[PDB]
């Protein structure tokens, strides 16, 4: 049974990237089961919509009274030292909100970490069939 934990906004860095205090240490964390287009990505650079998913990200866990992290069932790390969770600003989950923006895609999936995958899934076919930013 997946459980949320608190854990304290100390930056945003990217749309799918945000650095939080856990448990008290400083962590930067992966947003689970979404891509954002980057500001910040390794070879393209500034991508189309990447400072607006990015500016979604820093409003939302910005303006939250309380910030909750959930991980998964496999790994809660990636090769990159980053937590790979679900992350909730006042009970809504920005992993969803993003991508029922049209500011995300749906990540390609790696089994156990994949238990909000079919919820997300179905805001992805909604905002394609609003054709909202990445999909209009």
């Known amino acids: 049974k997946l459980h949320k934990e608190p854990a304290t906004l100390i930056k945003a860095i990217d749309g799918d990237t945000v650095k939080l205090m856990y448990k008290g240490q400083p ?3 992966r947003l689970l089961l979404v891509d954002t287009p980057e500001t910040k990505h390794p070879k393209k650079g500034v991508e189309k919509y990447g400072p607006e998913a990015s500016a979604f990200t820093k409003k939302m866990v910005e303006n939250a009274k309380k910030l909750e992290v959930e991980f998964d069932k496999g790994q809660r790390t990636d090769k990159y030292g980053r937590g790979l969770a679900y992350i909730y600003a006042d009970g809504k989950m920005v992993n969803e909100a993003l991508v029922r923006q049209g500011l995300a895609k749906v990540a390609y999936v790696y089994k156990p970490n994949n238990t909000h ?16 930013n990445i999909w209009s």
């Open 27 to 29: 962590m930067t964390f």
């Open 117 to 132: 995958e079919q919820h997300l899934r179905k805001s992805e076919a909604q905002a394609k069939k609003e054709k909202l």
